[PDB]
Amino acid sequence: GIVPVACSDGYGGLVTTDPKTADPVYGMVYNPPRTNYPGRFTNLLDVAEACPTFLCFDEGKPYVVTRTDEQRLLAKFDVSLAAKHMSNTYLSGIAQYYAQYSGTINLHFMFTGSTDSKARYMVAYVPPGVETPPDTPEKAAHCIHAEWDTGLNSKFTFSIPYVSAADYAYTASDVAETTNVQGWVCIYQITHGKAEQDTLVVSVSAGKDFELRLPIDPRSQ
Amino acid sequence: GIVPVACSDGYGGLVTTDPKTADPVYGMVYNPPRTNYPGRFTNLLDVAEACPTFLCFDEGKPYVVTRTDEQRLLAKFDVSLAAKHMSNTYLSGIAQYYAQYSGTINLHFMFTGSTDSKARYMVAYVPPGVETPPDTPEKAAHCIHAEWDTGLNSKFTFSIPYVSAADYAYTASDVAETTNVQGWVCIYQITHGKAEQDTLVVSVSAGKDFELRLPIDPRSQ
Amino acid sequence: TTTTGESADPVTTTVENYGGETQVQRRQHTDVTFIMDRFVKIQNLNPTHVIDLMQTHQHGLVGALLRAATYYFSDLEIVVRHDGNLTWVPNGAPEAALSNTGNPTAYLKAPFTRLALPYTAPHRVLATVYNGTSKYAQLPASFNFGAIQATTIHELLVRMKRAELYCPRPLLAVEVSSQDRHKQKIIAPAK
Amino acid sequence: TTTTGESADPVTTTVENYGGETQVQRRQHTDVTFIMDRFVKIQNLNPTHVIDLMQTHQHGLVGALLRAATYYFSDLEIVVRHDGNLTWVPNGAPEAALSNTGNPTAYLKAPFTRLALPYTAPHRVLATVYNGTSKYAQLPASFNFGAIQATTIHELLVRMKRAELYCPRPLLAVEVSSQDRHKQKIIAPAK
Amino acid sequence: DRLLTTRNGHTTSTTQSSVGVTYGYSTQEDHVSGPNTSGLETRVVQAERFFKKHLFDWTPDKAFGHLEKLELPTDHKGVYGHLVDSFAYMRNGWDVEVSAVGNQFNGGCLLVAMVPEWKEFTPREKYQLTLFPHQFISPRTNMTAHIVVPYLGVNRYDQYKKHKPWTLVVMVVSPLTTNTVSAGQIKVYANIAPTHVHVAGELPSKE
């Protein structure tokens, strides 16, 4: 006699993401060597961590600038990988293919002004719960924030913290909801000296614990 | 050559309750931690044992009361999880999903009267075999019974014993038959003193050896 | 036993009190993981459907038991009878994604498709009742197991795997008019 | 952290700086081999077809990720829905060979054919962009995984096995008009 | 012995008709620091103290099933309430004391329960409210109920503006009875203390 088997209903169909392998038909193929080929990356986030890309502000400029020396809200944007200001970044490029994330997102600020121009800036993380963002450094001071001088070192990095009710947040956005909008980031200029035409270039990268979760194919094809 | 197999007729179909698992298609998913989340229950009967729920008497009251100080049958009900008086209890809620049971069912009596009101009650288990239940404490005394005073302690618990010919009883009822009606429980007031408007709240829970047997889906859907 | 009822401390009296003897109990059937581990129907279907265990019938074996808990967690298995190919996307995905093969897509194979899916919500556990809003009654939109889409979805069956229930809630039997018992036709041999 | 931005040395500041605490990260999903390991469609088909991963959609999960690298290497799996028998020939073979059974030929068996193919190019790695010519814009003709031929090819799916990517390149999300966010319908329970 | 003194911060409550304390669903608190707050949460002990609310007047007319509820947190005019306005996220448990003073010559019985995720109960579901953490207040025995519950929900931290996990519920089980010597009605009051108060996500000032 032979082995009895029950060909089971509901099993067997092809699933584009299944964990099995096909049957081979052309054996004994040896490839040209590619040992130590340069620039290899094995995880998208290793790249997203080390290579910050630029934010997009008014008229598509990767920077902000103000002609007045008074306090001003230079820019505000939503803490969403779906944000308009993030739309040209590599981080957002990667994130559109995952349903959820959690973790630190790092902002980088680089001053490009002349030796004779000085400024003092502030960056704040405004969590959800307030109707609109603070329009002044005074009101925003009560939030998690950092202030800095322009000097010998042109770059300043700040971590936007992951603070939410759920353990993960959606990468996409839909309408003002708790799972898809995690507050705002506000960048202010406290004041400046002779920096009317000088700019602050802003870029973003992934933090030490930034994480993307569930693979998706949502682009219109 | 390859392995010969006999795809067997009568096997393979899907059975809603089969003991196998489907084939996976989306791997590597790590969940948010939920260690030590509170109020977990792993067996329905752990809950049914610790949380008694109320019986339902005339006009849907979870209690009985009498205005006369004489002996009276305050209430009688069928020892059936299908009984009218049990219809709002959690025990009956659970039992409707199992074909059979066996074991102890516990009744709880709580006196709510004022300090100046006293009473003496009796509870009896009348097994099947008599045409109708005893209408007086005297006649019911010959059964398995308990009597008690109202005092410092407001609650009294009594176990309705499982006594039947078969080892299991049906949870549902059909018509007077040996497998679906296991007698009555009769609650009497022997007498009372100034307890005309005072009540005896009754609730029920599962006993140490209460057991429910065969899973069913009998509700109209 | 006599106890102070008001405290609400559990009291489990025994047959021994009046000379009886307690009898050994086997409770495998009432075990939560076991009892929830079976296929149950979902009634309101559409070619695009979001998997929501609250779609289970309120008086069904699983439907009612699930409702009798406040919080729960579990993995899942589904059986779908569909025309065309079936695509599933995880919790949080744009509805637009159901149109693409890159997401788990199962090519039609009679008589239907049976799949094993992981819990994908962003919460540590889910709820059957939620007193409040998720937007800046119904349950929050994030309480789901993803969505499926095919040309036509004729049948859906769901099965809860590794189920965990917390915080039990009321569970009801049918109400009884008679005042003695609820009677119904129990199966019995013909003739 | 404050640093000299011009050098371009990587700077990864942390929540700790202002009293926070870094949280454990699992990145299996973003892993290159894993994320590329899934079936994706090829749209422009003909009864005689040369396998060219650049035929993948530019905004598809695999298509876009592949484009976001300069050089790559991988083995392959294909799923073909065809009429008649399917013949495959390796990189470098004369088109005329697709007519002969001596080459790997799969006899029709519903609903389709799934095969495992080896990388067969004469180069150590392939490219998604090539600045120059291969003849004595498009990519050199040698950047392919062989060719397939049947009477009619209705569907083709490709799957990258053992993928290795090098030299990353720009990867874009959809552009946003609103100036606040890109909003779209995220899946949510009916009713 | 039936004498109990409860302390929360710089506030105390002593009762000589105590039936003990009932712990619901747990005797402790899950990690108050998880990945969702990235270590930025902090504890505010100045909010962990008693505040008061009148629940209702228990009168003879109110029949079985009569139900009164108080969703928590409620409007708090103190430190705890300011927290709700100053921080995007919070979490805390509850130490609840409910009193119903009449005299020993009154009869009747109230059910005091703490319910997670409130939703209106049907008349039949009321026969099962004992599935929730509870105690009873019956004049012949006690004037006080005392329940202690931990924080819970699908989220490790909450936005109380938008969600109220716990709801205090008082239900008449057997109507108040009165005689020549008893009280006529009984006013029921709650004495509540938030426990293990943690906040995260400081908000900007409104001006």
Say whether residue E123 is in contact with chain D using an 8 A CB cutoff: no
Closest CA to A48 of A206, A162, A161, A208: A206
Mutation for E interface: D18, D22, D23, D26, most E CBs within 10 A: D23
C-alpha D147/C-alpha D121 separation (Å) is 12
Q: Which residue of D has its CA nearest to A176?
A: D183
Q: What is the CATH number of the domain that holds A82?
A: 2.60.120.20
Q: Do E127 and B89 touch (CB under 8 A)?
A: yes
Nearest to E177 by CA among E63, E54, E68, E65: E63
Q: Which structural domain range is residue A79 located in?
A: 1-221
Give me the long-range contacts of D100-107 (CB less than 8 A, separation at least 24).
D104/A25, D104/A26, D106/A25
CB atoms within 10 A of CB A197: 10
The DSSP secondary-structure symbol of B172 reads S
Q: How far, in Å, CA of B133 to CA of A62, rounded?
A: 90
Tokens 């390149």 sit on residue: D169
φ/ψ of residue A125, rounded to 5:
-105, 115
Strand-pair partners of E172: E110
Distance between CA A162 and CA E37 in Å, rounded?
7
Substitution target in B8, B23, B26 with the highest count of A β-carbons within 10 Å is B23
Given the DSSP bridges, would you call strands A155-160 and D2-3 parallel, antiparallel or unpaired? antiparallel
Which of the residues B46, B114, B115 would you substitute to probe the E interface, choosing the one with the greatest number of E C-beta atoms within 10 Å?
B114
What's the distance, CA B73 to chain centroid? 21
Breaks in chain D (C to N > 2.5 A) come right after 136
Q: Tokens in use for B190?
A: 């022997």
Nearest by CB to residue C8, choosing from E22, E127, E165, is: E22
Omega before residue B127 within 30° of 0, cis: no
Rounded Cα distance between B190 and B185, Å, is: 16
- The token pair that represents C186 in the structure block: 């129990």
C-alpha–C-alpha distance, residues C39 and C42, integer Å: 10
Residue C25 buriedness (CB in 10 A; 0-12 / 13-18 / 19+): middle
Q: Which domain holds residue D79?
A: 1-191
Tokens of B118: 């006293």
Q: Is D12 exposed, middle or buried (0-12, 13-18, 19+ CB in 10 A)?
A: middle
Kindly state the tokens that stand for D58. Answer: 């530019």
Q: Which chains form contacts with chain D, at 3 or more CB pairs under 8 Å?
A: A, B, C, E
Between CA C66 and CA C56 the distance in angstroms is 9
The answer to whether residue C169 neighbours chain E at the CB level (below 8 Å) is yes
Coil/strand/helix, residue A10: coil
The token pair at D59 is 């905004």
Q: Are C64 and C146 in contact (CB under 8 A)?
A: no
CB atoms within 10 A of CB E75: 7
CB B198 within 8 A of CB B97: no
Q: Are B198 and E150 inside 8 Å of each other by CB?
A: no
Query: Which bin fits E196, alpha (ψ -120 to 50), beta or left (φ > 0)?
Result: left
Nearest to B113 by CA among B53, B55, B60, B66: B66
Inter-chain residue contact A102 with D23, CB threshold 8 Å? yes
Q: Could you tell me the strand order of the sheet in which A169-170 lies?
A: A169-170, A100-102, A211-212
Q: Is D166 on the interface with B (CB under 8 A)?
A: no
As a 3-state breakdown, chain B gives helix, strand, coil percent values, each rounded to 5, of: 10, 35, 55
Q: Cβ of A19 under 8 Å from any chain C Cβ?
A: no
* Dihedral sign, Cα of residue B40, residue B44, residue B46, residue B49: positive
What one-character-per-residue DSSP string does B46-74 give? HHHHH--EE---TTS-SEE--S-SS-EEE
- Chain C residues with CB under 8 Å of E138 CB are 5-6
- The conformation of residue A139, written as its DSSP 8-state character, comes to H
Measured between beta carbons, the chain B residues lying within 8 angstroms of C185 are 174
Contacts 24+ apart (CB under 8 A), D6-12: D6/A154, D10/A49, D10/A50, D10/A51, D11/A106, D11/A108, D11/A155, D11/A157, D12/A49, D12/A50, D12/A106, D12/A157, D12/A205, D12/A207, D12/A208
Tell which residue, E78, E59, E67, has the closest CA to residue E175: E59
Q: Does A102 touch chain E (CB under 8 A)?
A: yes
Which secondary-structure segment (H or E) carries B7?
A: strand B5-7
A175 touches D183 (CB < 8 A): yes
SS3 annotation, chain E: CCCEEEEECCEEEEECCCCCCEECCCCCCCCCCCHHHCCCCEECHHHCCCEEEEEEEECCCCCCCCEEEEEECCCCCCHHHHHHHHEEEEEEEEEEEEEECCCCCCEEEEEEEEEECCCCCCCCHHHHHHHCCEEEECCCCCCEEEEEECCCCCCCCECCCCECCEEEEEEEEEEEECCCCCCCCEEEEEEEEEEEEEEEEECCCCC
Nearest-5° Cα angle at A106, A104 to A111: 165
Q: Phi/psi at E113 (nearest 5 deg)?
A: -130, 155
Q: Which residues pair with C156 in a beta bridge?
A: C42, C80
Integer Cα distance of C42 and C89 in angstroms: 18
β-pair partners for D86:
D106
Q: Using CA atoms, how far apart are residues C154 and C133, in angstroms rounded to an integer?
A: 33
Give yes or no for a contact between B45 and B210, defined as CB atoms under 8 angstroms apart.
yes
State the pairing for strand pair A63-64/A200-206. antiparallel
Q: For D147-162, b where at least 16 C-beta lie within 10 A, e where not — what string?
A: bbbbeebebbbbbbbe
> Measured between alpha carbons, how far is A125 from A102 in angstroms, rounded to an integer?
16
| Closest to B77 measured CA to CA, from B105, B111, B101, B110 | B105
Spatial distance between the Cα atoms of C161 and C141, rounded to a whole number of angstroms: 22
Calculate ∠ Cα D128-D134-D140, nearest 5°: 30
Pairwise CA distance, residues E9 & A110, whole Å: 49
Backbone angles phi, psi at A130, to 5 degrees: -110, 150
Neighboring chain D residues of C44 at a CB cutoff of 8 Å: 190-191
Evaluate whether C184 touches B96 at the Cβ level (below 8 Å): no
What is the number of domains present in chain D?
Answer: 1
User: Is the distance from CB of A212 to CB of A169 less than 8 angstroms?
Assistant: no
Asked if D57 contacts D82 with a C-beta cutoff of 8 angstroms, the reply is no
| Closest C-alpha to E98, from E108, E111, E107 | E111
**Contact yes or no for D5 and A170 at CB 8 A:** no
Distance CA E89, CA E12 (A): 28
Which domains are present in chain E? 1-207 (2.60.120.20)
Tally of CB atoms within 10 A around C9: 14
Candidate from C94, C102, C146 with C-beta closest to D61: C102
Q: Token match 């019956």: residue?
A: E138
Is E203 close to A140, i.e. CB distance below 8 A?
no
Looking at residue B173, the DSSP 8-state letter turns out to be B
Closest Cα in chain A, distance from residue C98 (Å): 8
Cβ(D160)–Cβ(D145) below 8 Å: no
> Among D35, D36, D66, D37, which residue's Cα sits nearest to residue D52?
D66
- At which residue do the structure tokens 């293919």 appear? A97
Chain E residues lying within 8 Å of A210, measured CB to CB: none
SS (H, E, C) D9-58: CCCCCCHHHHCCCCCCCCCHHHEHHHHHCCCEEECCCCCEEECCHHHCCC
D7: left (phi over 0), alpha (psi -120 to 50) or beta: alpha
Dihedral sign (CA E13, E14, E15, E19): positive
CA distance C73 to C163: 6
| C-beta atoms surrounding E34 within 10 Å | 20
Please state, in angstroms and rounded to a whole number, the distance separating the CA atoms of residues B137 and B150: 18
Between chains, do B62 and E64 touch, taking CB under 8 Å as contact? yes
- CA–CA gap between residue C147 and residue C94 (Å, rounded): 10
Query: CB of A59 within 8 A of CB of A176?
Result: no
**Beta B169-170 vs B100-102: how paired, if at all?**
antiparallel
Q: State how far Cα C35 lies from the chain centre.
A: 10
Given strand D86-89, what is the order of strands in its sheet? Answer: D48-50, D147-149, D86-89, D105-106
Nearest to C94 among A9, A100, A172 (CB): A172
Choose the mutation target among E31, E33, E38, E43 for the interface with D, i.e. most D CBs under 10 Å.
E38
In total, chain C counts a number of residues equal to: 191
Asked if C108 reaches chain A (Cβ–Cβ under 8 Å), the answer is yes
Does residue D77 sit at the A interface (CB-CB below 8 Å)? yes
Spell out the residues 6+ positions from residue D14 whose beta carbon is closer than 8 angstroms to its own. A104, A159, A207, A208, D20, D22
- E127 phi and psi, to 5 degrees? -75, -5
The helix (H) or strand (E) run that includes residue A44 is helix A44-50
Number of domains composing chain A: 1
Question: What tokens were used for A76?
Answer: 């505000």
Solving technique:
X-ray
For tokens 């990468």, name the residue.
Answer: A171
For C123, the closest of B32, B172, B173 (CB atoms) is B32
Tokens 């202690």 map to which residue?
A: E148
Task: Say if A110 is an interface residue toward chain D (CB within 8 Å).
Answer: yes
d(CA D120, CA E122): 70
Are D90 and D119 contacting, i.e. CB atoms less than 8 angstroms apart? no
Q: Which amino acid is residue B36, in one-letter code?
A: N
Query: How big is chain D, counted in residues?
Result: 191
Of C27, C71, C116, the CB nearest to B45: C27
Whether the bond between C111 and the residue before it is cis, its omega within 30 degrees of 0, is yes
Tell me, rounded to whole angstroms, the distance of Cα E22 from its chain centroid: 12
User: CB–CB of B113 and E152 under 8 A?
Assistant: no
Using DSSP, state whether A85 is helix, strand or coil.
Answer: helix
Residue whose C-alpha is closest to residue C69's, from C32, C29, C28: C32
Cross-strand partners of D127: D71
**Under a CB-based contact definition with an 8 Å cutoff, are residues C97 and C89 in contact?**
yes
* Furthest C-alpha separation in chain E: 63
HEC secondary structure over chain D: CEECHHHCCCCCCCHHHHCCCCCCCCCHHHEHHHHHCCCEEECCCCCEEECCHHHCCCCCHHHHHHHCEEEEEEEEEEEEEEECCEEEECCCCCHHHHHCCCCCEECCCCCCEEEEECCCCCCCCEECCCCCCCCCCCCCCCCCCCEEECCEEEEEEEEEEEEEEEEECCCCCCCCCCCCCCECCECCCCC
Q: Does A221 touch chain D (CB under 8 A)?
A: yes
* A176, A179, A221 member nearest C122 (Cβ): A179
Tell me, what CATH number does D176's domain have? 2.60.120.20
**Burial zone of B31 (CB within 10 Å; 0-12 exposed, 13-18 middle, 19+ buried):** middle
Q: What's CA A204's distance to the chain center, in Å?
A: 6
HSE, side-chain direction, 13 A CA sphere, residue E124? 16
Residue from A16, A96, A131 to probe the interface with C (highest C Cβ count within 10 Å): A16
Beta carbons of A165 and E157 less than 8 angstroms apart: yes
Taking an 8 Å cut-off on Cβ atoms, the answer to whether D23 and E40 are in contact is: no
Confirm if A186 and C144 have CB atoms less than 8 A apart: no
Nearest chain A residue to D115 by CA distance is A22
Tell me, yes or no, if A170 comes closer than 8 A to chain C by beta carbon.
yes
Handedness of CA B83, B88, B94, B98 (dihedral sign): positive
Provide the residue type at C14 as one letter. Answer: T
The two structure tokens encoding residue A59: 């008229």
Q: What are the distances in angstroms from CA E155 to CA A214, B146, C171?
A: 20, 50, 25
Distance CA A178, CA C182 (A): 47
Q: Which chains touch C (3 or more CB pairs under 8 A)?
A: A, B, D, E
**Which phi and psi (to 5°) does residue C93 adopt?**
-75, 145
How buried is residue C175: exposed, middle or buried, by Cβ count under 10 Å (0-12/13-18/19+)? exposed
Tokens 């009892």 appear where? C35
What is the stated resolution of the deposited model, in angstroms?
3.0
E203–A183 CB contact, under 8 Å? no
List subunits contacting chain B, requiring 3 or more Cβ pairs under 8 Å: A, C, D, E
Structure tokens at E36: 């969702």
3-state per-residue secondary structure call for chain C: CEECHHHCCCCCCCHHHHCCCCCCCCCHHHEHHHHHCCCEEECCCCCEEECCHHHCCCCCHHHHHHHCEEEEEEEEEEEEEEECCEEEECCCCEHHHHHCCCCCEECCCCCCEEEEECCCCCCCCEECCCCECCECCCCCCCCCCCEEECCEEEEEEEEEEEEEEEEECCCCCCCCCCCCCCECCCCCCCC
Q: Is D34 on the interface with B (CB under 8 A)?
A: yes
Contacts of A141 (CB under 8 A, 6+ apart): A122, A124, E204, E205
Residue A64 in tokens: 């902000």
Residue C164 sits at the chain B interface (C-beta within 8 Å): yes
* A34 in contact with chain C, both atoms CB, cutoff 8 A: no
Work out whether the CA dihedral D111, A218, D38, C148 comes out positive or negative.
negative
